[PDB]
């Protein structure tokens, strides 16, 4: 039971560290890039309407 719990805890801690360090910066950067891209599209539409 101790060995199985050690393996499970190692896998879970690796999963938490992976989730945070990889995914959360990755998804946050994707959100920022998407917001920037739609902001650029809105700015282009605004410029066309101003013209």
């Amino acid at each position: 039971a101790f060995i199985i719990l050690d393996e499970v805890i190692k896998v879970t801690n690796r999963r938490v560290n992976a989730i945070e360090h990889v995914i959360i910066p990755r998804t946050e950067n994707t959100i920022a890039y998407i917001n920037s891209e739609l902001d650029e599209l809105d700015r282009e539409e605004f410029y066309r309407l101003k013209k």
Binding site: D42, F46, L49, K50
Partner: protein
């Protein structure tokens, strides 16, 4: 007082109509076109249509006639200028009547017998004369009246999605609102006709109409009338509260519909749209509409506000929710998950808060345990949500005692406390008693946010 009204002002009838573009009617050779002047066009078929001028030039006015321009002819269309912007005949007897988007009564009763003609735009309240909201308005909604308190004179909006029963919650609040005199002023803009008749029969058959000046604006009703409606409700509220010394608690419905109406009014004047198509000055317009509420030092009345929004795509980053959150203090959220899980009201307390709650939940007003009970309930609801998420992760057995009890509290909270009948009225004291009844499943040591004296006296 109002004695200069005994003056007959002749009205100029301009046959000259230069152009008719979209919803606008462009006149020509006008004498002295006042901005925002109300205009009564006379179609060749004989129908009369109200209008409001949008852009002014040298002997040229652009009239934005209501009900569209279908039938407007250049050759034969008399245009009558009323040398005054839109004004409503306010009275103390308009409590108990239903008015249209343009202020015309749509009741079986007569036109309201005026006491004064107030400009719908109104004047800004002097900040030196403004007063911090102090007392509570008791609402039948136990979730609101306990966890997100409404103080007399604040602006607390309700954020909802399209399908959530925000209109039903509005009707419930209008029916059960009261002091813990009162006179609700209800304004619905861009509302579906089924919801409008629902408001009609609800207020007529529950006795709430003797205290409500209902302002219904249909979706098919004119969009400029949709613009005018919240101004009408706030002007009536200003009259009642400040020139009558009573509390109002206006409930504006479909601020999203009002924002769309503002969009159409702005784009009709050849103006570029702002961020999400909405006009850039939407912040200023919403600020006027909202900050038209509040308490004053000289008068004993108050104007509370519950502008009920409809968040498109359930996005808080949407301009209308963002600007409303900026201008107003606090917010009440209606949750799609809660609506799917159960029944009225689908209000979740985790994202919903009231900024001036501490003033409403005091010692002399309501009960001295209100703040502690509400904070404890919020904390234990958060812990219950965490435990509900954690059960499927770590198994039900492995949860601690403080997590199993918190899950039981969450069940009895989303199923008995928040869950309220659409017609049942819960006073603030009864709601606090029920909150204690839920909180008594814990050991006296578990309740940490509550003060020891309150725990000893109430638990």
């Amino acid at each position: 007082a109002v004695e200069q009204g005994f003056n007959v002002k002749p009205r100029l009838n301009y046959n000259t109509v230069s152009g008719v573009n979209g919803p606008l009617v462009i006149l020509e050779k006008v004498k002295f076109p006042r901005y925002n002047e109300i205009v009564n066009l006379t179609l060749p078929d004989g129908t009369v249509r109200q209008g409001q001028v949008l852009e002014i030039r040298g002997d040229r006015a652009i009239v934005q006639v209501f009900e569209g321009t279908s039938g407007i002819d250049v050759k034969k269309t008399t245009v009558e200028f009323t040398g005054e912007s839109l004004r409503i005949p306010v009275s103390e007897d308009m409590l108990g009547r239903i008015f249209d988007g343009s202020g015309r009564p749509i009741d079986n009763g007569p036109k309201v017998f005026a006491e004064d003609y107030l400009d719908i735009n109104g004047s800004p309240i002097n900040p030196y004369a403004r007063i911090y909201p102090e007392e509570m308005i008791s609402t039948g909604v136990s979730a609101i009246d306990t966890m997100n308190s409404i103080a007399r004179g604040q602006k607390i909006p309700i954020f909802s999605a399209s399908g959530l029963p925000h209109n039903e919650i509005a009707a419930q609040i209008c029916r059960q609102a009261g002091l813990v005199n009162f006179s609700i002023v209800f304004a619905a803009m861009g509302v579906n006709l089924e919801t409008a008749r629902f408001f009609k029969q609800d207020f007529e058959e529950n006795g709430s109409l003797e205290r409500t000046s209902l302002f219904l604006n249909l979706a098919n009703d004119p969009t400029i009338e949709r613009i005018i409606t919240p101004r009408l409700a706030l002007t009536t509220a200003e009259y009642l509260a400040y020139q009558t010394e009573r509390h109002v608690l206006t409930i504006l419905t479909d601020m999203s519909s009002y924002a769309d109406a503002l969009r159409e009014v702005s784009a009709a004047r050849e103006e570029v749209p702002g961020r999400r198509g909405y006009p850039g000055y939407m912040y200023t317009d919403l600020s006027t509409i909202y900050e038209r509420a509040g308490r004053v030092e000289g008068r004993n009345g108050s104007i509370t506000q519950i502008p009920i929004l409809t968040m498109p795509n359930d996005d808080i980053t949407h301009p209308i929710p963002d600007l409303t959150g900026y201008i107003t203090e606090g917010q009440i959220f209606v949750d799609r998950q809660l609506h799917n899980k159960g029944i009225y009201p689908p209000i979740n307390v985790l994202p919903s808060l009231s900024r001036l709650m501490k003033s409403a939940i005091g010692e002399g007003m309501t009960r001295k345990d209100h703040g502690d009970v509400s904070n404890q309930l919020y904390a234990k609801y958060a812990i219950g949500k965490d435990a509900a998420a954690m059960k499927a992760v770590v198994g039900e057995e492995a949860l601690s005692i403080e997590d199993k009890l918190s899950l039981e509290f969450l069940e009895k909270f989303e199923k008995t406390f928040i869950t309220q009948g659409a017609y049942e009225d819960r006073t603030v004291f009864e709601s606090l008693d029920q909150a204690w009844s839920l909180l008594r499943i814990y050991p006296k040591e578990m309740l940490n946010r509550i003060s020891p004296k309150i725990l000893d006296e109430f638990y």
